[PDB]
Amino acid sequence: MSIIVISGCATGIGAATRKVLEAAGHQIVGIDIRDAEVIADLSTAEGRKQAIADVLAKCSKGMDGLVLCAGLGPQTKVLGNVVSVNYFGATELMDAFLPALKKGHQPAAVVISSVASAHLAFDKNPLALALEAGEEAKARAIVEHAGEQGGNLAYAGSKNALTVAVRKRAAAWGEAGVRLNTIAPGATETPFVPPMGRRAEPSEMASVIAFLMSPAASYVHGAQIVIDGGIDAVMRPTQF
Amino acid sequence: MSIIVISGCATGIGAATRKVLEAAGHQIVGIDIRDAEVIADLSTAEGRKQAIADVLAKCSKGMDGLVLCAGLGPQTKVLGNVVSVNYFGATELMDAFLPALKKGHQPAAVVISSVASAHLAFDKNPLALALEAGEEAKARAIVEHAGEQGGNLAYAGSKNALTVAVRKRAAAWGEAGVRLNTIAPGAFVPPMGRRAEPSEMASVIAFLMSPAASYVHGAQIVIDGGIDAVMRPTQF
Ligand SMILES: NC(=O)c1ccc[n+]([C@@H]2O[C@H](COP(=O)([O-])OP(=O)(O)OC[C@H]3O[C@@H](n4cnc5c(N)ncnc54)[C@H](O)[C@@H]3O)[C@@H](O)[C@H]2O)c1
Numbered sequence: 452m453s454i455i456v457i458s459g460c461a462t463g464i465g466a467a468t469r470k471v472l473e474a475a476g477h478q479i480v481g482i483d484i485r486d487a488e489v490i491a492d493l494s495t496a497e498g499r500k501q502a503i504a505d506v507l508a509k510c511s512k513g514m515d516g517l518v519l520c521a522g523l524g525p526q527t528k529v530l531g532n533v534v535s536v537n538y539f540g541a542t543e544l545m546d547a548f549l550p551a552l553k554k555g556h557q558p559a560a561v562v563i564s565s566v567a568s569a570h571l572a573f574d575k576n577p578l579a580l581a582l583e584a585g586e587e588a589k590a591r592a593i594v595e596h597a598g599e600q601g602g603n604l605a606y607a608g609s610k611n612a613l614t615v616a617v618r619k620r621a622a623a624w625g626e627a628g629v630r631l632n633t634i635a636p637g638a639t640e641t642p643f644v645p646p647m648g649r650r651a652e653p654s655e656m657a658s659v660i661a662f663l664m665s666p667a668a669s670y671v672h673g674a675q676i677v678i679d680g681g682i683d684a685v686m687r688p689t690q691f
Numbered sequence: 692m693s694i695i696v697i698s699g700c701a702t703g704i705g706a707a708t709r710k711v712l713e714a715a716g717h718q719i720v721g722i723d724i725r726d727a728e729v730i731a732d733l734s735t736a737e738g739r740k741q742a743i744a745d746v747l748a749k750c751s752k753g754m755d756g757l758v759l760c761a762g763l764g765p766q767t768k769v770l771g772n773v774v775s776v777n778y779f780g781a782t783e784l785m786d787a788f789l790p791a792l793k794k795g796h797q798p799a800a801v802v803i804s805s806v807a808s809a810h811l812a813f814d815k816n817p818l819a820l821a822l823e824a825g826e827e828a829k830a831r832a833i834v835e836h837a838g839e840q841g842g843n844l845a846y847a848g849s850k851n852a853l854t855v856a857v858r859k860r861a862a863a864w865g866e867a868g869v870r871l872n873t874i875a876p877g878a879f880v881p882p883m884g885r886r887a888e889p890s891e892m893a894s895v896i897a898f899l900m901s902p903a904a905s906y907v908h909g910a911q912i913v914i915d916g917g918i919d920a921v922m923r924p925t926q927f
């Protein structure tokens with residue numbers, strides 16, 4: 452009846468989000484390497500193509516929501532996968548799912564970026580043009596040839612490009628009647644109480660996603676919601 | 692039982708916020724020039740000081756929340772008031788209420804800034820140094836001698852300084868165990884294709900004042916139907 456598609460649903464935020472949205476009465480179609488209705492590794496072009504097809508086959512009448520939580524962190528063995536999953540794993544899926552989203556009830560989507568998205572300027576992001584141009588092989592080569600902290604480049608670079616990608620889609624998605632926002636998590640407890648000085652439980656990310664997926668955020672669109680206990684504000688008080 | 696102080700409660704977002712927070716079971720202590728438990732004019736230092744004392748008198752045991760919605764837009768007769776209310780009307784109150792908030796239950800505060808806060812860079816803000824130093828007379832003088840479109844300067848400049856002020860208070864409020872965030876209402880046709888209802892600003896404030904936002908602090912939530920994204924895709 453009310454379908455919400457969730458990538459990266461097996462663990463962390465994706466899993467916590469699935470739990471919350473399921474309690475809200477939604478039917479979840481998850482995408483992940485395991486424990487998901489759609490088994491897929493989004494690190495390759497073919498893998499996402501198949502994941503997209505498998506999802507749509509289950510959402511012929513459309514979908515009410517989309518939450519893209521799949522992601523890989525810095526210090527991932529093969530840095531090329533960080534770029535593939537973090538960027539294309541999100542961009543290709545949201546772009547292919549928009550038609551189905553347009554047919555849903557109060558359709559909304561949330562993309563999980565990262566506070567890291569702001570540690571680099573898009574115009575000075577070594578991956579920007581390649582990613583924006585869909586040149587996956589090139590983007591993966593950039594980080595695998597970066598050397599020193601190529602991990603941070605791959606992570607912050609993909610996330611920064613991802614947040615911009617989402618923001619540049621605001622006009623089109625708005626026209627389609629589908630809200631699209633990102634959350635930018637800070638330190639999460641992935642293997643109430645004031646936020647400053649502690650990590651967040653994955654559920655604290657999920658509670659914000661639920662809000663962004665609900666009528667309470669009916670006028671929130673194209674925004675990046677930072678969920679980091681205040682760290683970003685201390686670091687960049689004049690930058691927002 | 693659960694007290695939430697709301698400035699600018701008489702109309703707009705402040706009125707809608709009072710409504711939603713009351714529907715949640717909160718007791719509201721409003722601050723405004725009319726239709727409020729605390730009648731006050733935040734455009735002057737003495738007005739704020741009196742407003743602060745009147746509120747604290749009703750919150751001797753503390754308060755659970757604070758929502759600062761008082762504000763004046765560009766094209767206000769006397770521009771000095773735009774700066775006084777938008778900036779000092781917010782900063783002096785949040786600073787004076789922190790001790791009370793600290794005594795609260797899951798205390799949180801929301802300041803209403805504006806997407807206009809992003810139209811200027813803090814280091815290029817003619818009011819920045821003046822407002823940060825608490826030089827109200829000088830700040831009012833700047834906008835009153837700005838001539839053409841002093842209204843946009845007063846507004847954007849006060850809002851920009853406000854967001855920065857709130858962010859510069861993240862460390863202290865974080866240490867005090869009180870969350871402090873801002874929402875930046877939109878202020879042509881947005882991507883979502885329509886104007887916002889005050890209730891759509893209030894529902895976000897309600898969220899920020901709730902446990903659902905337990906890990907959201909020092910953030911500025913833009914509520915503008917997508918305009919900011921279209922205008923500043925690479926800036927956030
Ligand atoms: N915890 C943090 O420090 C932090 C901070 C900022 C942003 N984030 C972001 O939040 C999101 C979720 O992070 P998390 O901390 O909950 O991690 P997690 O490991 O709990 O979840 C990540 C998910 O991505 C899936 N995944 C990984 N590679 C995949 C692939 N190649 N194909 C398909 N699915 C794949 C995993 O199976 C997993 O379910 C990510 O986008 C991440 O970058 C995390």
Ligand SMILES: NC(=O)c1ccc[n+]([C@@H]2O[C@H](COP(=O)([O-])OP(=O)(O)OC[C@H]3O[C@@H](n4cnc5c(N)ncnc54)[C@H](O)[C@@H]3O)[C@@H](O)[C@H]2O)c1
Nearest residue numbers: 699701702703704723732733734760761762803805876878
């Ligand atoms: N929705 C929008 O158009 C929009 C856009 C961007 C920012 N904002 C900001 O949101 C806040 C409230 O906006 P609104 O649209 O609900 O406005 P509104 O006019 O409906 O409410 C503003 C409130 O401020 C009060 N106020 C004005 N001067 C005061 C003073 N000198 N002393 C005490 N109280 C005073 C008013 O009486 C009123 O209750 C303001 O800070 C405003 O700048 C609104």
